[PDB]
Coordinates of C-alpha atoms and ligand atoms in Angstrom, one line a residue:
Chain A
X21 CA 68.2 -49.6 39.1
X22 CA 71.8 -50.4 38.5
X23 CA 73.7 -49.9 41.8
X24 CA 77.7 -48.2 40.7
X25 CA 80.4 -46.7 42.8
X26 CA 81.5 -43.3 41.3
X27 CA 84.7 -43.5 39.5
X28 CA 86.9 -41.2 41.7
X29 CA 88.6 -40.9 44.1
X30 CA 90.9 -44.1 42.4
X31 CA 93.0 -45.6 45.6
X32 CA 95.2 -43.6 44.7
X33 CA 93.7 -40.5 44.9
X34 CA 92.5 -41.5 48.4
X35 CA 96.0 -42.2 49.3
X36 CA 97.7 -38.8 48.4
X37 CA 94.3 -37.2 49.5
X38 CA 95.1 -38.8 53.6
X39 CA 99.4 -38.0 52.7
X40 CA 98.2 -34.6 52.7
X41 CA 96.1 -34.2 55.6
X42 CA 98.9 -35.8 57.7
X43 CA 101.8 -33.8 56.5
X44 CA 99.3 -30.6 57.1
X45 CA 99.2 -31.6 60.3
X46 CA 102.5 -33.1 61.2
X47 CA 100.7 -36.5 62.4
X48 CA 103.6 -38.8 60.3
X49 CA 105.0 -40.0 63.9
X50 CA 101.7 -41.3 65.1
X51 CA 101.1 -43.1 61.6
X52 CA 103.2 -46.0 62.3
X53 CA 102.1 -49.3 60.6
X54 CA 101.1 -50.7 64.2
X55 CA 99.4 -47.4 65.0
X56 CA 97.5 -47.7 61.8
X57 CA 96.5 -51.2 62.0
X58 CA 95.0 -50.6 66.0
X59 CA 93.3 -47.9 64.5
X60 CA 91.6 -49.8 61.5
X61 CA 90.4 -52.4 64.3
X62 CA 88.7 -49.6 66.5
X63 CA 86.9 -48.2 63.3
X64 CA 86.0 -51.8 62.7
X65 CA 84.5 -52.2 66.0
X66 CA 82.1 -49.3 65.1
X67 CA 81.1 -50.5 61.9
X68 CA 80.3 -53.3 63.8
X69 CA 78.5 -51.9 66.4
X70 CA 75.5 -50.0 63.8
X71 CA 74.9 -53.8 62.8
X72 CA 75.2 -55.6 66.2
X73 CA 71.6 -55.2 67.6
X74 CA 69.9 -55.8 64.0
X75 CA 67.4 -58.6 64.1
X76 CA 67.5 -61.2 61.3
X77 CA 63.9 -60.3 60.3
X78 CA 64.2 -56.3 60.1
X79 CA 65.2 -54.5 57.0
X80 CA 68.8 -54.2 56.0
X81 CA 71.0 -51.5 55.2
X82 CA 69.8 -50.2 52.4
X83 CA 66.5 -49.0 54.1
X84 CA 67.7 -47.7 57.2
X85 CA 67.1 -44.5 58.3
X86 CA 69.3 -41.2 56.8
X87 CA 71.0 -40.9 60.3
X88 CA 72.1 -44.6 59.9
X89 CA 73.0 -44.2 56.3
X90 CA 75.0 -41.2 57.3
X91 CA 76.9 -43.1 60.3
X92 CA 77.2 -46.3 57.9
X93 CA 78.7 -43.9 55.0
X94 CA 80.9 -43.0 57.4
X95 CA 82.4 -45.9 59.3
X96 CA 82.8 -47.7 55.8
X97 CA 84.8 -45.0 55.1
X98 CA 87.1 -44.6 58.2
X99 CA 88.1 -48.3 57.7
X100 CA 89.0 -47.8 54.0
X101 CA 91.4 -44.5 54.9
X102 CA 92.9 -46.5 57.3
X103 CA 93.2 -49.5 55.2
X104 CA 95.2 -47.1 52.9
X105 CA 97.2 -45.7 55.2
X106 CA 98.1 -48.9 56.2
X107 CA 99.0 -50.2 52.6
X108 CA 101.2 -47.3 51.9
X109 CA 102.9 -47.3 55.1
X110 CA 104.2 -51.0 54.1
X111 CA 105.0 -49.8 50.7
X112 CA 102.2 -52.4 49.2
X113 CA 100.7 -51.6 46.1
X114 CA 96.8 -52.2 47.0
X115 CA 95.4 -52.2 43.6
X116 CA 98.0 -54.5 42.3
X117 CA 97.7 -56.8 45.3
X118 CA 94.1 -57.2 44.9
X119 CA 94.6 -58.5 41.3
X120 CA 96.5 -61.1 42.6
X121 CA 94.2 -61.9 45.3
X122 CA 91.7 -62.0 43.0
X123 CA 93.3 -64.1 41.0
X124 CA 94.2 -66.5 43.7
X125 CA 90.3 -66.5 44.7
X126 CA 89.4 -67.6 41.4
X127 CA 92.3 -70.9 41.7
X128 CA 91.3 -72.0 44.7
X129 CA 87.5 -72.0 43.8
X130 CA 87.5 -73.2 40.3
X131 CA 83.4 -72.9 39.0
X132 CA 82.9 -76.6 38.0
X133 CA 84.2 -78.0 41.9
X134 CA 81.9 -75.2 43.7
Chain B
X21 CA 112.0 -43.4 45.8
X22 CA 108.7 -41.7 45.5
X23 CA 105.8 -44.6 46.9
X24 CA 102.5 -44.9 44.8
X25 CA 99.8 -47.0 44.5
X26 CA 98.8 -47.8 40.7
X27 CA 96.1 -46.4 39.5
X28 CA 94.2 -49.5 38.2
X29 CA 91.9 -51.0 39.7
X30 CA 89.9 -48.8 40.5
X31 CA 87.0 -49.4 43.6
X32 CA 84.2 -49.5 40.7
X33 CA 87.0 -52.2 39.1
X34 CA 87.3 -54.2 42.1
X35 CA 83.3 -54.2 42.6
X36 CA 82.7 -55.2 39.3
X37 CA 85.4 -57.6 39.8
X38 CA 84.2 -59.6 43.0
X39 CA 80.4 -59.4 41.9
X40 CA 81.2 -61.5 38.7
X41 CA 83.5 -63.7 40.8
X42 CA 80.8 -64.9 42.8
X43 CA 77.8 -64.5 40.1
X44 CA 79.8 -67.2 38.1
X45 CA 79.5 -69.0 41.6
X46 CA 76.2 -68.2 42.5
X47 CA 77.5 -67.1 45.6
X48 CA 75.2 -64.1 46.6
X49 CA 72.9 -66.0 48.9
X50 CA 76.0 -66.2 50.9
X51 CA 76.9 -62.5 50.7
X52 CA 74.1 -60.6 52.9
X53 CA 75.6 -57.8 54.6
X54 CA 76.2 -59.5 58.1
X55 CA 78.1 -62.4 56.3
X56 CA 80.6 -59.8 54.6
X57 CA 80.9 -58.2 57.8
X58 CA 81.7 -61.1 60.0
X59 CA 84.2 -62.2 56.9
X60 CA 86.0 -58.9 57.2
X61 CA 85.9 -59.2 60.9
X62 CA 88.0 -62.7 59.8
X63 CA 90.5 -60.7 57.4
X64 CA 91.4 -57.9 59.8
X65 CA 91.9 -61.3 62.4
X66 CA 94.4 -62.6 59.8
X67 CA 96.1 -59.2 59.6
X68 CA 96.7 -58.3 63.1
X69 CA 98.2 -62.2 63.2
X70 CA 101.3 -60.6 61.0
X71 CA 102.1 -58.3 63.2
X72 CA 101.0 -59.7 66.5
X73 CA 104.4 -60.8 67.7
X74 CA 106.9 -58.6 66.1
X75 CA 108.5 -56.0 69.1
X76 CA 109.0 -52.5 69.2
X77 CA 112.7 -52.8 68.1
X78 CA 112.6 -55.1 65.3
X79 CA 112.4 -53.7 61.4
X80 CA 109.0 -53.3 60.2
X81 CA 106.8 -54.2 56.9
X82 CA 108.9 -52.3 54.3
X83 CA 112.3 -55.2 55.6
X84 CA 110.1 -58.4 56.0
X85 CA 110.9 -61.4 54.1
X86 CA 109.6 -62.2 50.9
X87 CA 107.1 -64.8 52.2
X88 CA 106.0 -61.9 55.1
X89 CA 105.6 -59.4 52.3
X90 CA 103.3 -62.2 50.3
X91 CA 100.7 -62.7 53.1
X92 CA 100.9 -58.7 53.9
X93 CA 99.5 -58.2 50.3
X94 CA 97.1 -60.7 50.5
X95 CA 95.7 -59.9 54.0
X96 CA 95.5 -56.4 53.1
X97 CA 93.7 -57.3 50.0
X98 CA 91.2 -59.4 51.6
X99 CA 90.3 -56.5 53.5
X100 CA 89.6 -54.4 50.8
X101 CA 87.3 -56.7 49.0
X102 CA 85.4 -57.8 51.5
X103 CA 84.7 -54.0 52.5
X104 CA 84.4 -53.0 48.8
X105 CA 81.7 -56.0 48.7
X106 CA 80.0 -54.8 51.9
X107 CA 79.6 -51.2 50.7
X108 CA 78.0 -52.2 47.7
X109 CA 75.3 -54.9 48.9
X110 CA 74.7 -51.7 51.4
X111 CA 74.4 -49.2 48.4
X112 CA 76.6 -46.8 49.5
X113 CA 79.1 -45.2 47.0
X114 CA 82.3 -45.5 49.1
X115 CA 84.8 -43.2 46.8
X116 CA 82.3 -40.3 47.3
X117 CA 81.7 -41.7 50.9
X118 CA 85.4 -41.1 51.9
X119 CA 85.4 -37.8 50.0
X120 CA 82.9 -36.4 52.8
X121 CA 84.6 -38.3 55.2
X122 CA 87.7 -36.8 54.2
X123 CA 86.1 -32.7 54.9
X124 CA 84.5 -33.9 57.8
X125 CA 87.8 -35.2 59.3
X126 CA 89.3 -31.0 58.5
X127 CA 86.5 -29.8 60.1
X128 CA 87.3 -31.8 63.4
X129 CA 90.9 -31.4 63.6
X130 CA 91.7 -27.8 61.8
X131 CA 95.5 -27.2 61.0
X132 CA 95.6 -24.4 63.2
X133 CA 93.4 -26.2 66.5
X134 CA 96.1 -29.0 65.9
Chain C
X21 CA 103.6 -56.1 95.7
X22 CA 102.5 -59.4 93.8
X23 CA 99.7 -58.8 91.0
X24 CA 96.5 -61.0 91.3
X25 CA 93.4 -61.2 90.1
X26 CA 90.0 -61.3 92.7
X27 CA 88.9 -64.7 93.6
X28 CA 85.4 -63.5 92.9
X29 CA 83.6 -63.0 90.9
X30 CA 83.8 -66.5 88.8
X31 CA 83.0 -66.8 85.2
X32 CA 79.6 -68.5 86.6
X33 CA 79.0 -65.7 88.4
X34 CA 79.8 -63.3 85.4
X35 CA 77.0 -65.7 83.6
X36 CA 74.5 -65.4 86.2
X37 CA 75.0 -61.6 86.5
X38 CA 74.6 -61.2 83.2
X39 CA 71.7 -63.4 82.6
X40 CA 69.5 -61.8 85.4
X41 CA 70.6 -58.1 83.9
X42 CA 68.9 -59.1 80.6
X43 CA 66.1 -61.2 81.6
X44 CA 65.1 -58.4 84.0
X45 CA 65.0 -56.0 80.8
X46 CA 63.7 -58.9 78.5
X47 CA 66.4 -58.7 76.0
X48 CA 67.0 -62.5 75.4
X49 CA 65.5 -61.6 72.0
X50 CA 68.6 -59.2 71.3
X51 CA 71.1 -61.3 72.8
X52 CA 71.3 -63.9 69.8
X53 CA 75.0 -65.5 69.1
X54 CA 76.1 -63.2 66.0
X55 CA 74.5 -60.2 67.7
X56 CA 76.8 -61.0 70.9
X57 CA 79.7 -61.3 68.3
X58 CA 78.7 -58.4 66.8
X59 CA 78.9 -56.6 69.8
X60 CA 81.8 -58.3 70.9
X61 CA 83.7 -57.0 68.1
X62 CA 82.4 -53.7 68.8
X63 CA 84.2 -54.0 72.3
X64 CA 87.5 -55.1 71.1
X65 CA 87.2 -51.7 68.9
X66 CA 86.9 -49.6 71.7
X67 CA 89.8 -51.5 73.8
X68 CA 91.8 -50.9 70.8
X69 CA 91.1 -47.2 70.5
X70 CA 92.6 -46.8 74.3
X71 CA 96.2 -47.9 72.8
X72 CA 96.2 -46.8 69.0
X73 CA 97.9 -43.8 69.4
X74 CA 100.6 -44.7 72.0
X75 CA 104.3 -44.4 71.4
X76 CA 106.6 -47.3 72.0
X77 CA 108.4 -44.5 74.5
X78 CA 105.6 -43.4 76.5
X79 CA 104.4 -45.1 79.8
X80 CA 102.7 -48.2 79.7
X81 CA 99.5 -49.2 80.7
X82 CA 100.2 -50.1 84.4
X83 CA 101.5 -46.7 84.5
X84 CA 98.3 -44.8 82.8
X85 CA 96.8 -41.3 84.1
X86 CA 93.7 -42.3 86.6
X87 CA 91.4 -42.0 83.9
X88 CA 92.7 -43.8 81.3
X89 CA 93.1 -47.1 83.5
X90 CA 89.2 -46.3 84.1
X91 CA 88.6 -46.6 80.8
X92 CA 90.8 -49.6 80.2
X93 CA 89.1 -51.3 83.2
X94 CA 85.7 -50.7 81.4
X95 CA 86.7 -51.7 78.2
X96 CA 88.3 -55.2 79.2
X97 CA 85.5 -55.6 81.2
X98 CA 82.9 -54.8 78.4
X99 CA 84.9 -57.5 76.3
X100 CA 84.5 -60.2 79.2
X101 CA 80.6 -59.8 79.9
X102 CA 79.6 -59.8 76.0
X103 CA 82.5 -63.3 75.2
X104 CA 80.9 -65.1 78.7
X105 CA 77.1 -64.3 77.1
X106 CA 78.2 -65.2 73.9
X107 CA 79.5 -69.0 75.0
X108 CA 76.6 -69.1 77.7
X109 CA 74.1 -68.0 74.6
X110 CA 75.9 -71.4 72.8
X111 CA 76.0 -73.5 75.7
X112 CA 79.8 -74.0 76.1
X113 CA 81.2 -74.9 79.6
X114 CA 84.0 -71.8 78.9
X115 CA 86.5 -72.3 82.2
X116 CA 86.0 -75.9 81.1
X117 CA 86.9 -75.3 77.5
X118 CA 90.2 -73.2 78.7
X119 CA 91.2 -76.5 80.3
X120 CA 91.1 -78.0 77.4
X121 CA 92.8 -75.3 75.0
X122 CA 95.2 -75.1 77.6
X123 CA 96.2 -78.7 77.6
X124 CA 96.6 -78.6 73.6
X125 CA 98.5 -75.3 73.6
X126 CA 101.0 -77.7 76.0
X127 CA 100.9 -80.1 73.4
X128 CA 101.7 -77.3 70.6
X129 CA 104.5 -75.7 72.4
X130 CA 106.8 -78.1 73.8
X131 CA 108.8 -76.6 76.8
X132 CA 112.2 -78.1 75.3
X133 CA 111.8 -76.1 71.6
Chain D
X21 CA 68.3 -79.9 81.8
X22 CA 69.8 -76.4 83.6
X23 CA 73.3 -74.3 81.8
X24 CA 75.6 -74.0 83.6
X25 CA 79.4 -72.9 83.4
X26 CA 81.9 -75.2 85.7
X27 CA 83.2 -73.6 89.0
X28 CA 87.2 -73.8 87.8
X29 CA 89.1 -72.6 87.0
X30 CA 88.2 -69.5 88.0
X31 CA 89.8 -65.9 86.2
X32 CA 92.6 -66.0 88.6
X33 CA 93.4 -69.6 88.3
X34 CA 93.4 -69.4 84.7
X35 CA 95.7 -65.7 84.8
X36 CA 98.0 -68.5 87.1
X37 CA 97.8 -71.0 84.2
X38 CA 98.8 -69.0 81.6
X39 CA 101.2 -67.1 83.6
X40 CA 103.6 -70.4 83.9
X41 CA 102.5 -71.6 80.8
X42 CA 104.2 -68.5 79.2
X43 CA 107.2 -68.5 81.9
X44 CA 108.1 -72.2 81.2
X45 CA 109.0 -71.1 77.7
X46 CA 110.2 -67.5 78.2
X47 CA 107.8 -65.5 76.8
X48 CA 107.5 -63.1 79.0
X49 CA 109.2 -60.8 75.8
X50 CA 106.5 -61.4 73.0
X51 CA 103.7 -60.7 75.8
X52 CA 104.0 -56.9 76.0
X53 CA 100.3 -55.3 76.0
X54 CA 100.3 -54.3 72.4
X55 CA 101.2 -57.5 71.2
X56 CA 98.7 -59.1 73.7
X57 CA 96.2 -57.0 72.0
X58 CA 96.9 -58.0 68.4
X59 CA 96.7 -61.7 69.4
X60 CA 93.2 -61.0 70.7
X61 CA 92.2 -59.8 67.8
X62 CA 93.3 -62.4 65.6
X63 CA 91.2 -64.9 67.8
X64 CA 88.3 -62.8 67.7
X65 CA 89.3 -63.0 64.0
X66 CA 89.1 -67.0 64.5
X67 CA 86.2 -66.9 66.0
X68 CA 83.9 -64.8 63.4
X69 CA 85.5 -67.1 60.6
X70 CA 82.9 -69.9 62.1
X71 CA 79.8 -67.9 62.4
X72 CA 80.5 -65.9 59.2
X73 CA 78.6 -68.2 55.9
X74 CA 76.0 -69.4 58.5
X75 CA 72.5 -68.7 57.4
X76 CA 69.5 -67.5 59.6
X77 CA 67.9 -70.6 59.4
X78 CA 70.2 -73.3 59.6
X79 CA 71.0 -74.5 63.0
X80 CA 72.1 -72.6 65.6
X81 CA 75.4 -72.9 67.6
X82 CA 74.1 -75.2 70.5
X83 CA 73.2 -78.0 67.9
X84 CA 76.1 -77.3 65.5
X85 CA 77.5 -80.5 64.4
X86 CA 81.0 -82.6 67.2
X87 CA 83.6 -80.4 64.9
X88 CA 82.0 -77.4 64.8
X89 CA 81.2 -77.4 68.4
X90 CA 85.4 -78.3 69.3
X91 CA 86.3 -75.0 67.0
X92 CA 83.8 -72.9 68.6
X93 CA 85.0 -74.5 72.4
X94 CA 88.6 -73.6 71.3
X95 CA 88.5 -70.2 70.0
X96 CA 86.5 -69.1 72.6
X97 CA 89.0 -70.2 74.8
X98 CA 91.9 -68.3 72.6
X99 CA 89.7 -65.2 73.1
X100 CA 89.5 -65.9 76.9
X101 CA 93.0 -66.4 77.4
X102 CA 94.4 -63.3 75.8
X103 CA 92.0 -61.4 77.5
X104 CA 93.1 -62.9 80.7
X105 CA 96.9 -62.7 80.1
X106 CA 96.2 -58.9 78.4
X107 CA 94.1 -57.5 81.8
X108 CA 96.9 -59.1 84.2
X109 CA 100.1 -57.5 82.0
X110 CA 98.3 -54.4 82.6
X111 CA 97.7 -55.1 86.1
X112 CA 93.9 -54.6 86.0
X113 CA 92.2 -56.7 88.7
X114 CA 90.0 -58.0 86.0
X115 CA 87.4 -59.8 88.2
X116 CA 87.2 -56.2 90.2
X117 CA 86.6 -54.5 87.0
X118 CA 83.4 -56.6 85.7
X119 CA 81.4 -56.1 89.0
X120 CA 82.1 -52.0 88.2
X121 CA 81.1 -52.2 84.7
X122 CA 78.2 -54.1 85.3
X123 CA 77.5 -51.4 88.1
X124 CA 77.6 -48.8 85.7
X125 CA 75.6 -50.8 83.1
X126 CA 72.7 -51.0 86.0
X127 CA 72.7 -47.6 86.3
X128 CA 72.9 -46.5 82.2
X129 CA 70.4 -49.0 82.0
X130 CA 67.4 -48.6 84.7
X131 CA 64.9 -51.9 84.5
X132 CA 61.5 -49.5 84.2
X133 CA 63.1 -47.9 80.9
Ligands
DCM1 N1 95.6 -39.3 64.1 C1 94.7 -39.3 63.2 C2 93.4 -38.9 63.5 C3 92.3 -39.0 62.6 N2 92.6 -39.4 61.3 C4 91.5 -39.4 60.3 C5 91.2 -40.8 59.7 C6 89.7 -41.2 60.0 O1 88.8 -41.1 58.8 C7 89.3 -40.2 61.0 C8 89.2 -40.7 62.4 O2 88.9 -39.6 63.3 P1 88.4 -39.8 64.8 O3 89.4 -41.0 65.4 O4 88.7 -38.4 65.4 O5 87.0 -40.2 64.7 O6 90.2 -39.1 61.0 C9 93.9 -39.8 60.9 O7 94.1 -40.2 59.8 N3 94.9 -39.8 61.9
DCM2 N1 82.2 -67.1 50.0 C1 83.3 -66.4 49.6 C2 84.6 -67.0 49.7 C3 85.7 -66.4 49.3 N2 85.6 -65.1 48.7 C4 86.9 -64.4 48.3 C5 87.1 -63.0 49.0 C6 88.5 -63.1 49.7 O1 89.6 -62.3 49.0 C7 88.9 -64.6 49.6 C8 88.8 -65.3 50.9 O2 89.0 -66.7 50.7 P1 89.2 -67.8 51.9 O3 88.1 -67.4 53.0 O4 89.0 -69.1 51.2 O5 90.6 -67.5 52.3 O6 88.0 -65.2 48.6 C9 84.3 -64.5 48.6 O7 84.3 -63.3 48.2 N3 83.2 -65.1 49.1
DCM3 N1 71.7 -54.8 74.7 C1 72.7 -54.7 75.6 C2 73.3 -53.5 75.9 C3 74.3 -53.4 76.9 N2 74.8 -54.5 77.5 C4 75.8 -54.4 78.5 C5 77.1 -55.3 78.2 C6 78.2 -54.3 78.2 O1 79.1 -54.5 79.3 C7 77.6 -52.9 78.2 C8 77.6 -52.3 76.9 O2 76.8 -51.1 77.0 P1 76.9 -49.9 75.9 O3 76.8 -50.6 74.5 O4 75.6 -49.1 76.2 O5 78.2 -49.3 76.2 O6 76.3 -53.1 78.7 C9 74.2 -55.8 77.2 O7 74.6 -56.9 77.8 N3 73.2 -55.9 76.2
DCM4 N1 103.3 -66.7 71.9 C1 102.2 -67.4 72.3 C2 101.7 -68.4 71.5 C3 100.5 -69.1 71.9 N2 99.9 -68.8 73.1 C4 98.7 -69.5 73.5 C5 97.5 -68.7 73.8 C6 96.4 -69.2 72.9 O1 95.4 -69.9 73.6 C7 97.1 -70.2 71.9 C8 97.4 -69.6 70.6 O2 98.2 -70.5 69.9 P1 98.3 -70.4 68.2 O3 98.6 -68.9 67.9 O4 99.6 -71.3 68.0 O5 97.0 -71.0 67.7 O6 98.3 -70.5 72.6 C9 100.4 -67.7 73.9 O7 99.9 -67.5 75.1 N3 101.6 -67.1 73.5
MG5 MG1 84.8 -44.1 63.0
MG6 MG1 92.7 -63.9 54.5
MG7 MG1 82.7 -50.3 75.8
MG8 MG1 92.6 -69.7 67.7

């Protein structure tokens, strides 16, 4: 069947959501854009490591077991709230940037040369 | 002035938008989940390269010049879609995915622990 | 007190170390080049996790609490066994290939700009 | 035909090497730990960029085609040298350090398991 992300949280939403639980906690100091960005690289490194001992022939992610899913869920996500963070901290405007990007992709691979 | 992100697109928007991007490129045979990881591996490489020689003194992202600011965008945004495309070929519904992320991360540092 | 390194062991030696510690456990079969990477990556997490949080103000890391530079010690370590398995596992000469980066950085970076 | 790595440069020879390499130009400034760190993993970066569109069942690394084997020789070696130039500006006898982990590795890891 049809495979969908839900339609909230927008990037947005995720972004005011992690503003909050900062401020709450008066963690603003530690949120520095270099702080963020070593931070988003260590939650990388454990996304990596749920894929690193996979073997080319075994099933992929979307038939590992729930514990996986759950850790897999998970790192996905710490990379993405960090990946915010990040964004905001720099005052980019992620949404907007990825249109560009986007756009970009599609000039530098036109369909009729690929 | 107040910082926000826009609030389009949305993750199901930028999904939608990279799966026909490489549909109308016939792409997916390239985009099995260890691929997209070791492609956002690459973009988090290109990130940290922006930042890898500024000091401690120095202003940060918010001053860089406008050519700095350009690759920050894009970098940032190559992030995103690669990770947006990774969740997706995995099956797992990242907005909702951060939102239990998100309690999970109160539950382990309470306001009043912290 | 001038900083060195150990003349021993050698990036060989790392190699051979390393090889006998998997072939003794038979896990040539898990040891394939993008799992290495993989875990390589993995590695460079955890070194990163060490310094996220650090202020510019605070010590530095020749001046860590003991067990922080343990942990720094591991994690640069676990960094250098999986990148020496992971050229071995593609049969490149590494300390021969540093030679050569070496000599292009040179080339690169003029001394007089 | 056996693999081997060369015998030099060793780990300290090549924390020597960079050492002058980055004295000669006065860049003792830009190489604080953290931006050490970064480099690192923008090379690491580098490196996955080669491996990443590779299939399963194309060829493998050790028979990857003269220009493809140079890239993968060189950013191996960028990875190497950060390392290197990371562990000494943190004065971590880096050598020293691999001979604990794998140690400890032994141990977390016994052969009849
Ligand atoms: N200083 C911190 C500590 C944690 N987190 C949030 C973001 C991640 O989703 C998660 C990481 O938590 P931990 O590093 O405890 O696993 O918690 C944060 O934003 N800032
Ligand atoms: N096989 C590919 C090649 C490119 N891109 C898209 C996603 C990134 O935003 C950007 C990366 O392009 P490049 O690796 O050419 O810089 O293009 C993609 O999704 N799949
Ligand atoms: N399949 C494995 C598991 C571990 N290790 C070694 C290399 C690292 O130095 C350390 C990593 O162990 P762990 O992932 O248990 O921390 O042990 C290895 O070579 N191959
Ligand atoms: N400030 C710098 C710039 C370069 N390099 C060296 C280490 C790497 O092997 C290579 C990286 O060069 P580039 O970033 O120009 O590819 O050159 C260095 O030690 N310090
Ligand atoms: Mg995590
Ligand atoms: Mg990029
Ligand atoms: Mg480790
Ligand atoms: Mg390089």
């Amino acid at each position: 069947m049809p495979f969908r992300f839900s339609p909230e949280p927008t990037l947005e939403d995720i972004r005011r959501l992690h503003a909050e639980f900062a401020a709450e906690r008066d963690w603003e100091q530690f949120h520095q854009p270099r702080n963020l960005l070593l931070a988003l690289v260590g939650e990388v490194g454990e996304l990596a490591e749920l894929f690193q001992w996979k073997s080319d022939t075994e099933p992929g992610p979307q038939a590992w077991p729930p514990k996986e899913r759950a850790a897999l869920q998970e790192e996905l996500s710490d990379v993405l709230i960090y990946l915010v963070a990040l964004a905001a901290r720099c005052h980019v405007d992620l949404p907007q940037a990825v249109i560009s990007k986007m756009d970009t992709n599609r000039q530098r691979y036109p369909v009729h040369l690929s």
